[PDB]
Design a protein around this ligand. Sequence first.
Ligand code: NA
Ligand code: NA
Lengths: 329, 329, 329, 330
Amino acid sequence: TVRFGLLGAGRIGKVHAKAVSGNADARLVAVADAFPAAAEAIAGAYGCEVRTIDAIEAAADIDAVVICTPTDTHADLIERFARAGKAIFCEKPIDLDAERVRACLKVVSDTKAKLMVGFNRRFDPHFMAVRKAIDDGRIGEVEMVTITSRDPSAPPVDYIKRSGGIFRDMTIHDFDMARFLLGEEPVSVTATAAVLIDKAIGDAGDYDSVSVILQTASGKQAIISNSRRATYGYDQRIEVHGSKGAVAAENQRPVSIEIATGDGYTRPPLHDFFMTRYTEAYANEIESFIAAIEKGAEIAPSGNDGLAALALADAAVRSVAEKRQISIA
Amino acid sequence: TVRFGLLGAGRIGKVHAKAVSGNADARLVAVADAFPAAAEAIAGAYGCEVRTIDAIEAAADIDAVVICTPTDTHADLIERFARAGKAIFCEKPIDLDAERVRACLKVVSDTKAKLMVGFNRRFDPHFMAVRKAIDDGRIGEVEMVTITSRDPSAPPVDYIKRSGGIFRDMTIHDFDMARFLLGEEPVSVTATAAVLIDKAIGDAGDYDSVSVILQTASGKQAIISNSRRATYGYDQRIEVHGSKGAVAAENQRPVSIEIATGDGYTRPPLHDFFMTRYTEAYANEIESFIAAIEKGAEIAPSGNDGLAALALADAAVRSVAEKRQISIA
Amino acid sequence: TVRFGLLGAGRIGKVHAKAVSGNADARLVAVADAFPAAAEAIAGAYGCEVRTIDAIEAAADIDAVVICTPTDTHADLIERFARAGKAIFCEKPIDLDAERVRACLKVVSDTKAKLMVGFNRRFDPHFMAVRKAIDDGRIGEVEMVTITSRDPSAPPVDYIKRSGGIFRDMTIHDFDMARFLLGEEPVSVTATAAVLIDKAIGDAGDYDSVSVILQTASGKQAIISNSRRATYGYDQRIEVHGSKGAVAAENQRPVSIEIATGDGYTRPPLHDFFMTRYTEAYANEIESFIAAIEKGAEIAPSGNDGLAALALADAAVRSVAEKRQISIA
Amino acid sequence: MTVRFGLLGAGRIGKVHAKAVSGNADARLVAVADAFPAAAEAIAGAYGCEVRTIDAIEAAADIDAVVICTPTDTHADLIERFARAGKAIFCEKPIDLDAERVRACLKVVSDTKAKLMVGFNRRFDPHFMAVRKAIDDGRIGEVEMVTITSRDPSAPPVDYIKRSGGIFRDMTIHDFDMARFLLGEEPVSVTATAAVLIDKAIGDAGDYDSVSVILQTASGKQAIISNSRRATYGYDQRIEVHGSKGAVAAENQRPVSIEIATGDGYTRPPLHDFFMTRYTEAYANEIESFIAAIEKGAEIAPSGNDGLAALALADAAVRSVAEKRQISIA
Ligand code: NA
Ligand code: NA
């Protein structure tokens, strides 16, 4: 069985701890975090040791690591763990700077490391079923993709300043989803953006409401709509229109009931955020990773996928600034 | 009693006739049409006269006209009937050339004439309830609009050649819808396009699958998605995300049943023909005209709504060709 | 051209007058009612005559009659017009007393008259589609039928006293629906009942909340649920489970929008009034009556359908009182 | 503290509880038993617990609680034995098919102050719980009329049918419990109909496969229940409650929710095959509630009396079909 070390014991870390513990072929061996209480919290809940990042790098009883530390640490930590011969799962992003990313990937290649990036949406049972429908020919040739993502609320200002901006922090999942759904590469990005929700996000130099169109060489188009706040919860919809039809995945909620009164028919709001919306996705993610470890199996999403997504995000940022379509090729 | 002349005895003409005839405050006095069998059938159906356009224009027993003739006759007809002192309902568009439309409206302004343009979707009960919800404060401030429209099949190449292209012929309804749903004027347009469905359309100098982002001065965004072909029928969706919540209108189908087997739960496809989808909007549209004549209120959608829609289409054509964001004057 | 007399100028009469007039194969010739002004308002609108019932019965220029007068006149009027050789459409029921109904139908049979009873739900587009799915074999052999009907508001006591009680007045439509969906005769009825909504209904000797199970000789079962009051509107559902799958018809509302907030996703309530739900069914029913006259066609729903549905109501009453399953002779 | 569990029975239902016990943070699966050692071994293999005998689990100091997933004819005796041995007991439905036997069993459970929860897992489903909570919160006013539809993907085999006590005792039993859960009051009368519409071999075995039931309470509230042994579209599990101020319903669940639209229509996937995947959250919540009962001493629901009450409704349904009349509940 595959022995895991977890780095980062915050929201994202907890979600991965659960997934690892839930997986029958995986053992969660140690946790590390800057805040010791935060690693202890997970150590208790799951019965694993607390350790330093250094110690996990050094330990021969760690086959793989899961990196859920802050954004600034990622590229460094991947390189370190690839040097030490660990299989690596790293949460988005590899880095905010595309050149730093390329450097980090050279190391992975040179060390022959297994790296999976965290685009968890590719492992959602619902979104997977959309992709399998496309693969089975149910909608013919893909033509037009529509992706709408709305977070329940914006992060605080401090996270925004470090985050790399909405396109890189939020829209990046959707850029990856567009690549996942289209079946081929976007070669052009045009984007609009505004600050409609909270001035303070503008003051920090970010946007909170963005719209994007990507186009491939064959003309297929993907439209992305993003908003940092929705009162009804975590909006996560995909839709693909094709020559033979369309396929969509509806929004998920934790509980599905309906109450009818003179005021109408009411169903509950959506999941608060990724923690509960993507529980099954996290389990499928870890399982894929394990298959990619214990067998020599194709890793996806790869380091190449994290870069391509950032490339689109960078190209969107510029599109907004230069008020025009930005080539990628 | 409002005395009507009808110019155009085709499919739409037949509908508007039905509406006018059955309205208690209006009478269909005469019909004019280049197809003499078509004008005769309507005359027989509603016991009114067949007249030439000239006779209807010069007649003293006609208070208003419904213009359902081909697009290239619209501007000229509007000017003539304004000068003759009739009130005018014209089917979209006024003309295809912005410059021509401007000159037409100068004539409507100077004659002080009543002109409604046929943007029927403003009169759809479902879309009207969406706008009403926004008016009632139910979603707070409008932030992001998404509009999806897909026809059940492409037009024939002869129709395409005199249509003025997808942005002017199809998307024009969505541009108006966007203005209807946004609080505000769009001041920028950006667009992508392709020929995904039938190369005969690309040859004829047109696109069949287009995407459009519009932004207002306050930064509000509307996204428009159009496809000329959808095997599942006539797809007409609007959604508006706001600060307090979101509102949307659902697709319509002629019967609401569901059959469940080992293959799944299946509901029928949507309407296979636009006129069946919009039977109520066409009725409300004329009813509203006839009512706005009598009390003599100011009219929407108006000539300028006709122009603004077209200019937005014009900017979309440029935006694709110039691969950049185009500003509205 | 089928020439009609309308007997009864209340709200139902007005709707039926519309249907007859608008039909290319029918003319509304005369209208009777106990209140002169009611009859005059209809006749005047359709440019036809006010006549006495006696005159319509004697008249050689009347081919068919629509009966919309009070229930206690139906059996007598049907007999009269059957003897007079007119085709007959009668609003339910023939009479509240099954022996009286049997007498009426013997006269109908000896005179070889044509009689349709107004079980308008058989002509609803949605319920017809369900029945067509069954006829086409899409659910295999019918096994289990579930019918739910709930009114928006309970009727006033004076309505109740002349209604024959909930089973004869309300459930009667569901009993006919059951026969229509089962495609074979129920032979047993088991029912329960209560006064849950308004004690005044119980004080008048009636119930407001009832449950019924019908079973056929082959063992197929239909369950019926009825409530006199639902704050969410006029609930009318049918479901049929069969050997290969199941089929259901969904509730109808005036507009199809949805608002999402932190309180959840809310669709509007159902129609608040029954005639608004059944617009098309009333139109189809009359259309189909007129086509059956033009042809020499077999008229359904027939007098016998009227009797069969009442016999089920009578058995339900007795089942409630005697706490047992009642066999239908 | 950690609750130490012995599992008795390693079939389908046993596997589902193994998973739920395993998945719970406060519990450890220590021992499995089964009459077929391969089946037990398989569960021991996959979870790293021991294969013991039932006698051993009974005598074991290192067992706090048992989950009884053995055949139905062993339930009442096993409950009495583990009650006397001081284990907390979770028992899959039924306690017994015979109400007098159930009564004798509950007397032993009461005399030994044993903790017994019976397996009406539907009460722990997040969707059904939220229906009940909405009713508790007053969102539909006073309950008036309940409608429950349950349809299995396909019928069990004849050998199972013959030892099952028949469709009312074996299938509808869950819906009788659900009706009591939703109504808030006891049914006092049962009237039912039945037939063999699906497979004549069920009828030849003395059972029915398609049944309809109406329950009524003293205040007049009514519950209609519809059951079919076979639905091509999967495991149909719906509840609906009409009240004075509105209605509340839980829709069916399916494993994947997508929609494909073509000229043929808009198609969503079929439902869950069976209880194994439909009720995974419910089985977690149930074990969680059982542990809470063990840890805090809270009174248990679904209790022994709830198992008895559902069986008494089933017995009344059987009589109602045979006698063609409404049967009152003692
Ligand atoms: Na006529
Ligand atoms: Na555990």
